[PDB]
Amino acid sequence: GVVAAAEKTKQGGVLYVGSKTKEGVVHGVATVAEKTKEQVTNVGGAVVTGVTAVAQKTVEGAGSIAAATGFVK
Amino acid sequence: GVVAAAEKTKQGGVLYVGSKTKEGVVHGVATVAEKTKEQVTNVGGAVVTGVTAVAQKTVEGAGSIAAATGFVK
Amino acid sequence: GVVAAAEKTKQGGVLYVGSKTKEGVVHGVATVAEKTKEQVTNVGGAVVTGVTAVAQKTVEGAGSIAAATGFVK
Amino acid sequence: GVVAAAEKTKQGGVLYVGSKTKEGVVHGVATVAEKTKEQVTNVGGAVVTGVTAVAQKTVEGAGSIAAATGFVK
Amino acid sequence: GVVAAAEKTKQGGVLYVGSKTKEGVVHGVATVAEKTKEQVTNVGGAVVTGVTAVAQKTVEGAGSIAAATGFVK
Amino acid sequence: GVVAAAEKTKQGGVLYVGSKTKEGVVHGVATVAEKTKEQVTNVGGAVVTGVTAVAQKTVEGAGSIAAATGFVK
Amino acid sequence: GVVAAAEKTKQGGVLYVGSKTKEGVVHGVATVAEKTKEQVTNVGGAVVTGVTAVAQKTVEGAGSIAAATGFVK
Amino acid sequence: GVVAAAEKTKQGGVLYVGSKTKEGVVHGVATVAEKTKEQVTNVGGAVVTGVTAVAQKTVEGAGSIAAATGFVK
Amino acid sequence: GVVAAAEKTKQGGVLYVGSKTKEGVVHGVATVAEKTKEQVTNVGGAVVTGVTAVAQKTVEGAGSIAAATGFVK
Amino acid sequence: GVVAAAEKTKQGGVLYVGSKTKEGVVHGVATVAEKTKEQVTNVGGAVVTGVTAVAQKTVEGAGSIAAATGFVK
């Protein structure tokens, strides 16, 4: 019995980034495995991956994540 | 029994990014495996992947993610 | 029994990005596997992948994602 | 029993991106596998893939995604 | 029993992108496999793939996606 | 003053190769460049390129190669 | 003053190779450059490139290679 | 003044290789550069590149290689 | 003044290799550079590169290699 | 004044290798640099690079290598 819910109702800065680089190698989320049952992901926020990875104001509301497994009985 | 829901009702910055690079290698989400039952993904936010990966104002409401498995009985 | 729903009703910045690069290799979401039952994806947000991957205002409402498996009985 | 629904009713920035590059290789979503039952995708948001991949205002309402499997009985 | 529905009723920015490139290779969604039962896709959002892949205002309502499998009994 | 000469005068094994493959990509000699004066090649031996590239008894005599440049004065 | 010469005069094994592969990528000689005067090659032996690249008895005589540049004066 | 010479005059094993692989990436000789005067190669032996790269009895005589540059005066 | 010479005149084992692998990446000779005058190679022996790279009896005579530069005066 | 010479005149084992591997990364000779005058190589022996890199009986005679630079005057 898996339920997940979010309401956002409404009744009504500066950033300078400069990267001068050479040779980046960037990974985001990785799950790596061998011989597995499940590999879930739920991204109810964000996954931001960049050499210059700016995430402004990123979740401004109402994330809802359920996740389950199990119940072998 | 899997339910997931979101309502957003309504009744009513600066960013400069400069990347001067050479040679990026960027991964986002990766799941890598061998010999698996499931590999789920649910992106109820965002996945943003870039060399210059800007994610502004990214979720402004009402993400709903359920995820399940199981119940072998 | 899989249900997922979202209503958005209504009753009523600056960004400069400059990437001067050479040689990017960018991956977004990848699931890679061997010998698997399922590989699901549900993108109820976004997947944005770019060398210059800007995701502005990206989800402004009402994402609903259910995902399940199981029930072997 | 798979149900998914979304209503958006209504009763009522700047971006500059410049990528000067050479040689990009960009992947979006990829699922890669060997010897599998299913490989689903449901894109109830967006998948945006570009060298310069701008996703503005991307989901402004009412995404609904269900996904299931199972029930071997 | 697969149902999916969306109503949008109604009772009532700037972007500059310049990519000066040379040699892009861009993939969108790809599912690649060997020896599989199903490979579904449902794009109830969008899939946008470009060297310069701009997706403005992309889903402004009422996506509905169901997806299922199963029921071996 | 470029001179090159070879005389072969005359006054008088087993190999099993089996390649069972799938998907080869083979390059031989490549010179790749940008903005160049000369790109010479002289093949006074052999260039053998194959997925299964057998070169038996390949030069049995008398290769002569000169190569020059220069002399700006 | 470039001279190169070879005389072969005459006055008078087992190999089993089995490659069972999948997916090779093989390069031979490569010179890769940017903004160059010369790129010479002289192959007064052999260049053998293969997934299964057997070079038996390859030079049995008399290779002669000169190579020069220079002399700006 | 470049001279190179070789005479071969005449007055008068087992090998089993088995490679059972998957996924090789093989490079031979590579010279890679940026902004160069010369890039010479002289192969007065052999260059053998293979996934299974057997070089038997490879030079049985008389290699001669000269190489020069210089003399700016 | 560059001279190189070799005469081979004539007046008159077991090997088992088995590589059972998965995923090799093999490089041979590489010279890699940036902003260079010369990049010479002279192969008056052999360059053998393979996943299974057998070099039997490889130089059985008479290699001659000269190499020079210089003389700015 | 560069001279190099070799004469081989004539007037008249077991090996078992088994590599059962997974995932090799092998480099041979590499010279890597930035901002250089010369990068020479002379291979008057052999360069053997392999995952299973057997070099039997490799130089059986008469290697001759000269190499110089200099003489700025």
Side-chain angles (χ1 to χ4, degrees):
Chain A
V2 184
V3 178
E7 297 89 10
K8 174 189 168 75
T9 76
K10 281 186 68 176
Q11 283 81 16
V14 179
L15 178 59
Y16 187 114
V17 179
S19 173
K20 175 180 174 183
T21 171
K22 170 180 178 296
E23 166 62 27
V25 176
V26 184
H27 287 260
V29 170
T31 65
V32 182
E34 304 188 357
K35 190 182 256 80
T36 310
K37 286 191 175 185
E38 287 89 6
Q39 295 169 359
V40 184
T41 302
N42 295 311
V43 183
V47 175
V48 174
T49 299
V51 169
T52 314
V54 184
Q56 202 176 21
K57 305 184 179 74
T58 302
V59 179
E60 288 187 354
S64 180
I65 302 161
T69 319
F71 294 86
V72 200
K73 285 188 196 151
Chain B
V2 184
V3 178
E7 297 89 10
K8 174 189 168 75
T9 76
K10 281 186 68 176
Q11 283 81 16
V14 179
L15 178 59
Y16 187 114
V17 179
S19 173
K20 175 180 174 183
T21 171
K22 170 180 178 296
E23 166 62 27
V25 176
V26 184
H27 287 260
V29 170
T31 65
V32 182
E34 303 188 357
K35 190 182 256 80
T36 310
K37 286 191 175 185
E38 287 89 6
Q39 295 169 359
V40 184
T41 302
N42 295 311
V43 183
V47 175
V48 174
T49 299
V51 169
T52 314
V54 184
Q56 202 176 21
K57 305 184 179 74
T58 302
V59 179
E60 288 187 354
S64 180
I65 302 161
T69 319
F71 294 86
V72 200
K73 285 188 196 151
Chain C
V2 184
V3 178
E7 296 89 10
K8 174 189 168 75
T9 76
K10 281 186 68 176
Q11 283 81 16
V14 179
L15 178 59
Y16 187 114
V17 179
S19 173
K20 175 180 174 183
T21 171
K22 170 180 178 296
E23 166 62 27
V25 176
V26 184
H27 287 260
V29 170
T31 65
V32 182
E34 303 188 357
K35 190 182 256 80
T36 310
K37 286 191 175 185
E38 287 89 6
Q39 295 169 359
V40 184
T41 302
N42 295 311
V43 183
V47 175
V48 174
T49 299
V51 169
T52 314
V54 184
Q56 202 176 21
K57 305 184 179 74
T58 302
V59 179
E60 288 187 354
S64 180
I65 302 161
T69 319
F71 294 86
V72 200
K73 285 188 196 151
Chain D
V2 184
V3 178
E7 297 89 10
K8 174 189 168 75
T9 76
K10 281 186 68 176
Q11 283 81 16
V14 179
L15 178 59
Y16 187 114
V17 179
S19 173
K20 175 180 174 183
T21 171
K22 170 180 178 296
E23 166 62 27
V25 176
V26 184
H27 287 260
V29 170
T31 65
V32 182
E34 303 188 357
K35 190 182 256 80
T36 310
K37 286 191 175 185
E38 287 89 6
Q39 295 169 359
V40 184
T41 302
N42 295 311
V43 183
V47 175
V48 174
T49 299
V51 169
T52 314
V54 184
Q56 202 176 21
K57 305 184 179 74
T58 302
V59 179
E60 288 187 354
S64 179
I65 302 161
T69 319
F71 294 86
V72 200
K73 285 188 196 151
Chain E
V2 184
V3 178
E7 297 89 10
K8 174 189 168 75
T9 76
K10 281 186 68 176
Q11 283 81 16
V14 179
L15 178 59
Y16 187 114
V17 179
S19 173
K20 175 180 174 183
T21 171
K22 170 180 178 296
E23 166 62 27
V25 176
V26 184
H27 287 260
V29 170
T31 65
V32 182
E34 303 188 357
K35 190 182 256 80
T36 310
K37 286 191 175 185
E38 287 89 6
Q39 295 169 359
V40 184
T41 302
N42 295 311
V43 183
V47 174
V48 174
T49 299
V51 169
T52 314
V54 184
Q56 202 176 21
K57 305 184 179 74
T58 302
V59 179
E60 288 187 354
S64 180
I65 302 161
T69 319
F71 294 86
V72 200
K73 285 188 196 151
Chain F
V2 184
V3 178
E7 297 89 10
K8 174 189 168 75
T9 76
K10 281 186 68 176
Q11 283 81 16
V14 179
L15 178 59
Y16 187 114
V17 179
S19 173
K20 175 180 174 183
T21 171
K22 170 180 178 296
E23 166 62 27
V25 176
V26 184
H27 287 260
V29 170
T31 65
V32 182
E34 303 188 357
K35 190 182 256 80
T36 310
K37 286 191 175 185
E38 287 89 6
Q39 295 169 359
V40 184
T41 302
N42 295 311
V43 183
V47 174
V48 174
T49 299
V51 169
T52 314
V54 184
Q56 202 176 21
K57 305 184 179 74
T58 302
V59 179
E60 288 187 354
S64 180
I65 302 161
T69 319
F71 294 86
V72 200
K73 285 188 196 151
Chain G
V2 184
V3 178
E7 297 89 10
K8 174 189 168 75
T9 76
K10 281 186 68 176
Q11 283 81 16
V14 179
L15 178 59
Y16 187 114
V17 179
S19 173
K20 175 180 174 183
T21 171
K22 170 180 178 296
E23 166 62 27
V25 176
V26 184
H27 287 260
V29 170
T31 65
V32 182
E34 303 188 357
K35 190 182 256 80
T36 310
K37 286 191 175 185
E38 287 89 6
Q39 295 169 359
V40 184
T41 302
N42 295 311
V43 183
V47 175
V48 174
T49 299
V51 169
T52 314
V54 184
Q56 202 176 21
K57 305 184 179 74
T58 302
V59 179
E60 288 187 354
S64 179
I65 302 161
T69 319
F71 294 86
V72 200
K73 285 188 196 151
Chain H
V2 184
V3 178
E7 296 89 10
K8 174 189 168 75
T9 76
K10 281 186 68 176
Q11 283 81 16
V14 179
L15 178 59
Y16 187 114
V17 179
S19 173
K20 175 180 174 183
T21 171
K22 170 180 178 296
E23 166 62 27
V25 176
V26 184
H27 287 260
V29 170
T31 65
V32 182
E34 303 188 357
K35 190 182 256 80
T36 310
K37 286 191 175 185
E38 287 89 6
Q39 295 169 359
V40 184
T41 302
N42 295 311
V43 183
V47 175
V48 174
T49 299
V51 169
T52 314
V54 184
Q56 202 176 21
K57 305 184 179 74
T58 302
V59 179
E60 288 187 354
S64 180
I65 302 161
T69 319
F71 294 86
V72 200
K73 285 188 196 151
Chain I
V2 184
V3 178
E7 297 89 10
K8 174 189 168 75
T9 76
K10 281 186 68 176
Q11 283 81 16
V14 179
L15 178 59
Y16 187 114
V17 179
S19 173
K20 175 180 174 183
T21 171
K22 170 180 178 296
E23 166 62 27
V25 176
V26 184
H27 287 260
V29 170
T31 65
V32 182
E34 303 188 357
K35 190 182 256 80
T36 310
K37 286 191 175 185
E38 287 89 6
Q39 295 169 359
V40 184
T41 302
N42 295 311
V43 183
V47 175
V48 174
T49 299
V51 169
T52 314
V54 184
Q56 202 176 21
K57 305 184 179 74
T58 302
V59 179
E60 288 187 354
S64 180
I65 302 161
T69 319
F71 294 86
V72 200
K73 285 188 196 151
Chain J
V2 184
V3 178
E7 297 89 10
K8 174 189 168 75
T9 76
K10 281 186 68 176
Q11 283 81 16
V14 179
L15 178 59
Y16 187 114
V17 179
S19 173
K20 175 180 174 183
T21 171
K22 170 180 178 296
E23 166 62 27
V25 176
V26 184
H27 287 260
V29 170
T31 65
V32 182
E34 304 188 357
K35 190 182 256 80
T36 310
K37 286 191 175 185
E38 287 89 6
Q39 295 169 359
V40 184
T41 302
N42 295 311
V43 183
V47 175
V48 174
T49 299
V51 169
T52 314
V54 184
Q56 202 176 21
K57 305 184 179 74
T58 302
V59 179
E60 288 187 354
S64 180
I65 302 161
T69 319
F71 294 86
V72 200
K73 285 188 196 151

